[PDB]
């Protein structure tokens, strides 16, 4: 997959959303897609934005991945 090896800057997400994930040190797109919606709602400053910004990219949260990170 050509999206997993890219950082979180390839989304053009909102500045409010662009700063929230940096609190938990989200480095990879795979890193953010591993974590589901049931625990990302805890962080303050998305629920009505992340699904639609990710659907057009052919990706969605909740997928299960192994050998991660492969470095």
């Amino acid at each position: 997959d050509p999206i997993l090896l890219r950082p979180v800057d390839d989304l053009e997400l909102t500045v409010r959303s662009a700063n929230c994930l940096k609190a938990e040190a989200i480095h990879y797109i795979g890193d953010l897609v591993q974590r589901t919606e049931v625990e990302l709602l805890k962080t303050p400053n998305s629920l009505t934005e992340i699904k639609d910004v990710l659907a057009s990219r052919g990706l969605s949260l909740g997928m299960r991945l192994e050998n991660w990170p492969p470095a």
Binding site: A23, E24, A25, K42
Partner: protein
Amino acid sequence: MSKRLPPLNALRVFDAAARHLSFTRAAEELFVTQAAVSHQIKSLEDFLGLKLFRRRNRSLLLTEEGQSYFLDIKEIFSQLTEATRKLQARSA
């Protein structure tokens, strides 16, 4: 690592819950409703994982699970209220 501190509200009602011995009477001192106490015990439980009180008939007793975490709340509000006094006093 972002330091996820406890909420700014669950701590003060937790100190008055033991002193007042009743949850309903714990809300009149903090000019809030009784339902607000149960809203904040869960959010703070995410870090602890331990239950704060044990149910008793017409009484409130102390459990060891939440007892360890009493000892690190009552000094936070003491000094911050003192902190408010210092700037206010020196300003005048």
